[PDB]
Design a protein around this nucleic acid. Structure first.
Ligand code: MG
Ligand code: MG
Ligand code: MG
Ligand code: MG
Ligand code: MG
Ligand code: MG
Ligand code: MG
Ligand code: MG
Ligand code: MG
Ligand code: MG
Ligand code: MG
Ligand code: MG
Ligand code: MG
Ligand code: MG
Ligand code: MG
Ligand code: MG
Ligand code: MG
Ligand code: MG
Ligand code: MG
Ligand code: MG
Ligand code: MG
Ligand code: MG
Ligand code: MG
Ligand code: MG
Ligand code: MG
Ligand code: MG
Ligand code: MG
Ligand code: MG
Ligand code: MG
Ligand code: MG
Ligand code: MG
Ligand code: MG
Ligand code: MG
Ligand code: MG
Ligand code: MG
Ligand code: MG
Ligand code: MG
Ligand code: MG
Ligand code: MG
Ligand code: MG
Ligand code: MG
Ligand code: MG
Ligand code: MG
Ligand code: MG
Ligand code: MG
Ligand code: MG
Ligand code: MG
Ligand code: MG
Ligand code: MG
Ligand code: MG
Ligand code: MG
Ligand code: MG
Ligand code: MG
Ligand code: MG
Ligand code: MG
Ligand code: MG
Ligand code: MG
Ligand code: MG
Ligand code: MG
Ligand code: MG
Ligand code: MG
Ligand code: MG
Ligand code: MG
Ligand code: MG
Ligand code: MG
Ligand code: MG
Ligand code: MG
Ligand code: MG
Ligand code: MG
Ligand code: MG
Ligand code: MG
Ligand code: MG
Ligand code: MG
Ligand code: MG
Ligand code: MG
Ligand code: MG
Ligand code: MG
Ligand code: MG
Ligand code: ZN
Lengths: 83, 208, 99, 104
RNA sequence: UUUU
RNA sequence: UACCUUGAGGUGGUA
RNA sequence: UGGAGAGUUUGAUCCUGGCUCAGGGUGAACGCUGGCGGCGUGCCUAAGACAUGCAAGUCGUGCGGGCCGCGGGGUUUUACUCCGUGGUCAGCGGCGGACGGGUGAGUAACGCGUGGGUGACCUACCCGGAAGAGGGGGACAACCCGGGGAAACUCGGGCUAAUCCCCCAUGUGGACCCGCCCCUUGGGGUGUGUCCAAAGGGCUUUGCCCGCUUCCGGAUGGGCCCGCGUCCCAUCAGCUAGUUGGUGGGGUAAUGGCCCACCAAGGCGACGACGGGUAGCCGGUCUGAGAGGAUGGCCGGCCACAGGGGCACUGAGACACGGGCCCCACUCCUACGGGAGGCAGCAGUUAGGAAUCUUCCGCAAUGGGCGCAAGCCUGACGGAGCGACGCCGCUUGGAGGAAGAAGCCCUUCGGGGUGUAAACUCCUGAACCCGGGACGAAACCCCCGACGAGGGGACUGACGGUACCGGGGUAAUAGCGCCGGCCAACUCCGUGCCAGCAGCCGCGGUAAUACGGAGGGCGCGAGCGUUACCCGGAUUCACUGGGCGUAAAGGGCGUGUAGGCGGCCUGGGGCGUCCCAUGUGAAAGACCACGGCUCAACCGUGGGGGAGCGUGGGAUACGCUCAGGCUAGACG
């Protein structure tokens, strides 16, 4: 079951994740299938969250269950809005 | 640490006036001023023709011993200068001229570089507003090197920024004496600097 | 000690014994069918092929055989029966072969 | 794409199987000189259609056996033992260059 | 014869 | 171990 | 955007040529020394042996019970018994336990790398689409009864539930045989015959949720196969019987001597078979002007292993590190019959060693398993601890201060040196103290809305009272190596071929810039030296880039096999070669730019390059091949 979750890339105390598609069984920081965004929990810059609704929507449309947090982030970036 | 110790002795070994004390180095006493021979029990005996090596070694020392930087930092800067575009020798000098402690010196907020350094590590200096206590902090162009209000009323700062009244400053810089603040306008062009150092020889000391 | 997974073992044993039994019939009947065919007894040689067929697919229902494993068996069986009945046979009940 | 190679048939001695000597050429990784290496493939000849001296194309295929994973795609040019010869002689040279010495 |  | 003799030694001499 | 050389064979010279030094690097270790912080990093040797705790479970919304408890019923009361409910223990059943974590033993190999094949295949959970779930029967644990054993644990008898097992049915559909069609290896369609489905549960109870069955497809993961590439020794040259191929069969998801029976007599090798040695491979790392050399620790990918060897069971998946069986070695228990074990998981012990840490905090964050959910589990992870092991940042003070203290050192006894150095004056003020005090955390969930979109609300941090901010405030660690030349830095005294130094050349036999000390000097600075190891310099294995008369080096000569090399003209092909396009070349790293932490180290984002190989198209001078021709080579 492929997923859309976060991958740890910062440094001690300087966390930086990568919203990423991957097979649920892989290391969290391992070989991902595709990077579909990034996110800085500490918002150290005005650009602490980018996604790519297009790609997010592709993977979602083909299984890919997102982590609760990833789901959250995806939402915030207009992934599910339909209005 | 950064040396600490008999300094108007480095002046003597290098056989030229290095200003590592600001005042006094102008008075009839910098030692280089009457007693120009290197320190130690041998300084007065006739010198032997120096090996090309000796020259560059002494030449590199002269230049580094000026900014009070450690061989470590000095070396790293030079390496960065080499890797960078533009004529390395030039770039090197500029990069050194960009150290905050140095700018604090060029602007006159302090007499010497050592004094300048302490004024930085003691938080009396500010960059664009926030204070910076990193002598090796690199100043970009357009940044505002200044004194923190909480420090503008210190006897040292006074004597210093006062003596600066009417006194002119480096063309790559600018100073507003009353506001106790200055600006790093441009990377000093090699020609702007007038250091008693033939940097080409330094590039060579590091090629060997 | 004691890591309640011995359970998984306990179960494996029950499952093993269940699979084992299922396959055993499949073989027995298959052979049986192959035997009657190689003797010309068409009507019942097929009769049993039909059972073997059922038992195979049936085994493939759960995880005893499962897969194309089931299919091979069915294949090879019909394969050998129709062929052995090439001794005057003449499929009667056609309880499995489509002539 | 299934690999396709060309070579000479240098052995008929097998049932439904021919040994195809495929020559290869290329620049030496360090010395440049274009060198020529070669390798024998045991290709599948179902209807024993090909014979000694037949330049044939070989096609990458589903394993027919061990040591045998190519089928003969077609016949390029027939007859020409000049090649089979080079090969045969080279094998014969090995003759005795062991404890004694092959034959020249 | 040893060493210079 | 010391002096002879060496530049200083080896051997050798004188206790 | 990139390339330095020097010392040493001689009385002297040129050359040859080896040795040696300067540079860079390291999971280091050792000596003298040692203040703070950030980020990294830390058994390289015994894949040696391990005490102890923790490291994989979860689900009452699949099921029936035991034990401990409360409440309400059927009576006039009792016995007996019915319902509801709390705690608890496992059991049956399910999903997970094949991931995550560890190690490098083995392996020179389709193991890895790169590019391809699969008409020869599989894929649980996830997504899309089609269809469906009617009826009946059954057993084993739990529990109950009895027996065996020291123990582990075990044998028998009986009762019983289910999403447990089975039979019949329905056949969307699918599987198999035969035929036909299209395709072309086993791909797709079609006809007859045969065979094959299902499970229930929860409710905000007529609907919705979780779930079940069959089929088609998607997505992800994977098996198998192939071209090319992958260390040393030829003082290893011949190797091979399932060995090479064939027919049939077994086996698997699937091809295949994978295995078997039968037949054939093959297969491999100097383009290095076979044997021996060594070794996980890679992205990359270090070095280098480059070509190249060396390397494969941290991190990421793949492989292999789990005390040594073998084996299969269960499963979508294992031949299964914390599952099973057997043999072996060792340890433990033993009523001597028989049993229990497996840290190359975190931490820790011991042994080996020059040498490598805490039996720590937390599940808050990211990630994972199970659950509708609450939530549980998670030594994965996020943090802290220890070690200058590395990198980066910071301090031990700043300005003034005598033609110059004392002491020590030298002395032509005038003086010279350490030295603005100290003293001392003034200034700032690391530590330390007081107060405040964080981002990392907004989801899951609940409410409104249709459990959707969307909006509203609540809970939650180990690190941490830490970072950071404000206030107050003390002049407050320096050491190590070297000073004959290479190589930057010189004098006195001691010693007397001694004691000693020493990287190479060499230095010491009474004037030693070379020994030990001292004054002084050079270098670097919380380090500095040493030892080991890799690249460099070394065009000193020379592809870039060397040589062989006398320096090391032409084979004693010929004949000749393989192989390497090939005169002039034309044409065909287009293999080499060259060109365009396209696919591939993961991330990290490296480079460039910008950005976050006061800087930097460290990190984030974006950009650019890229050999090799696949595919399609093209060129034809040279090489190649085929065909024709020539006469200058050759032969007659
Ligand atoms: Mg440059
Ligand atoms: Mg369970
Ligand atoms: Mg001597
Ligand atoms: Mg003597
Ligand atoms: Mg000589
Ligand atoms: Mg000489
Ligand atoms: Mg001579
Ligand atoms: Mg030389
Ligand atoms: Mg640390
Ligand atoms: Mg640590
Ligand atoms: Mg180890
Ligand atoms: Mg050990
Ligand atoms: Mg062990
Ligand atoms: Mg109960
Ligand atoms: Mg339970
Ligand atoms: Mg290994
Ligand atoms: Mg070997
Ligand atoms: Mg391959
Ligand atoms: Mg590949
Ligand atoms: Mg595949
Ligand atoms: Mg579905
Ligand atoms: Mg019974
Ligand atoms: Mg049907
Ligand atoms: Mg139908
Ligand atoms: Mg049925
Ligand atoms: Mg069932
Ligand atoms: Mg697939
Ligand atoms: Mg070998
Ligand atoms: Mg090994
Ligand atoms: Mg080189
Ligand atoms: Mg790794
Ligand atoms: Mg084993
Ligand atoms: Mg074992
Ligand atoms: Mg399973
Ligand atoms: Mg199975
Ligand atoms: Mg296991
Ligand atoms: Mg096992
Ligand atoms: Mg295994
Ligand atoms: Mg274990
Ligand atoms: Mg351990
Ligand atoms: Mg020891
Ligand atoms: Mg957690
Ligand atoms: Mg979680
Ligand atoms: Mg636990
Ligand atoms: Mg950790
Ligand atoms: Mg004095
Ligand atoms: Mg004096
Ligand atoms: Mg001072
Ligand atoms: Mg927040
Ligand atoms: Mg929670
Ligand atoms: Mg909502
Ligand atoms: Mg010198
Ligand atoms: Mg001497
Ligand atoms: Mg002397
Ligand atoms: Mg010396
Ligand atoms: Mg000395
Ligand atoms: Mg430092
Ligand atoms: Mg070297
Ligand atoms: Mg070389
Ligand atoms: Mg050599
Ligand atoms: Mg050459
Ligand atoms: Mg030479
Ligand atoms: Mg000679
Ligand atoms: Mg010679
Ligand atoms: Mg000759
Ligand atoms: Mg000779
Ligand atoms: Mg020839
Ligand atoms: Mg030619
Ligand atoms: Mg042509
Ligand atoms: Mg031509
Ligand atoms: Mg071509
Ligand atoms: Mg390309
Ligand atoms: Mg990359
Ligand atoms: Mg910045
Ligand atoms: Mg990047
Ligand atoms: Mg092409
Ligand atoms: Mg042409
Ligand atoms: Mg011709
Ligand atoms: Zn001075």
């Amino acid at each position: 079951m492929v997923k859309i979750r976060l991958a740890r890339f910062g440094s001690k105390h300087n966390p930086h994740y990568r919203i990423v598609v991957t097979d649920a069984r892989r290391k969290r920081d391992g070989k991902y299938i595709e990077k579909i965004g990034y996110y800085d929990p500490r918002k150290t810059t005005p650009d602490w969250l980018k996604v790519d609704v297009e790609r997010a929507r592709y993977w979602l449309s083909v299984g890919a269950q997102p982590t609760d947090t990833a789901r959250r982030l995806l939402r915030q970036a207009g992934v599910f809005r339909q209005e | 640490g950064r040396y600490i110790g008999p300094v108007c002795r480095l002046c003597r070994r290098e056989g030229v006036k290095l200003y590592l004390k600001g005042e006094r180095c102008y008075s009839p006493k910098c030692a280089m001023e009457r007693r120009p021979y290197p320190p130690g029990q041998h300084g007065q005996k006739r010198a032997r023709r120096p090996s090309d090596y000796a020259v560059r070694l002494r030449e590199k020392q002269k230049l580094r011993r000026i900014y009070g930087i450690s061989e470590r930092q000095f070396r790293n800067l030079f390496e960065e200068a080499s890797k960078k575009k533009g004529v390395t020798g030039s770039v090197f000098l500029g990069l050194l001229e960009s150290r905050l402690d140095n700018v604090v010196y060029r602007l006159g907020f302090a007499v010497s570089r050592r004094q300048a350094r302490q004024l930085v590590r003691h938080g009396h200096i500010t960059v664009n507003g926030r204070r910076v206590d990193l002598p090796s902090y690199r100043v970009r162009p357009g940044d505002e090197i200044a004194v923190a209000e909480k420090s503008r009323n210190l006897e040292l700062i006074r004597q210093n920024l006062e003596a600066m009244k009417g006194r002119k400053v480096g063309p790559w810089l600018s100073l507003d004496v009353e506001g106790m603040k200055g600006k790093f306008l441009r990377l000093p062009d090699r020609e702007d600097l007038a250091l008693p150092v033939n940097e080409q020889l330094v590039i060579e000391f590091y090629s060997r | 000690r004691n890591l309640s997974a011995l359970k998984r073992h306990r179960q494996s044993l029950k499952r093993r014994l269940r699979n084992k039994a299922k396959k055993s019939a499949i073989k027995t009947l298959s052979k049986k069918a192959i035997q009657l065919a190689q003797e010309g007894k068409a009507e019942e040689a097929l009769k049993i092929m039909r059972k073997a067929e059922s038992l195979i697919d049936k085994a493939a229902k759960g995880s005893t055989l499962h897969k194309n494993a089931a299919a091979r068996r069915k294949s090879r069986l019909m394969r050998k029966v129709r062929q052995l009945l090439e001794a005057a046979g003449a499929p009667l009940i056609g309880g499995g072969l489509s002539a | 794409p299934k690999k396709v190679l060309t070579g000479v048939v240098v052995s008929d001695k097998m049932q439904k199987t021919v040994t195809v000597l495929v020559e290869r050429q290329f620049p030496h990784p360090l010395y440049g000189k274009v060198i020529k290496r070669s390798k024998k493939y045991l290709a599948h000849d179902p209807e024993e259609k090909y014979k000694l001296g037949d330049v044939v194309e070989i096609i990458e295929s589903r394993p027919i056996s061990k040591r045998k994973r190519f089928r003969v795609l077609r016949l390029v040019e027939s007859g020409r033992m000049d090649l089979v010869e080079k090969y045969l002689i080279r094998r014969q040279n090995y003759q005795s260059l062991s404890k004694r010495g092959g034959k020249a």
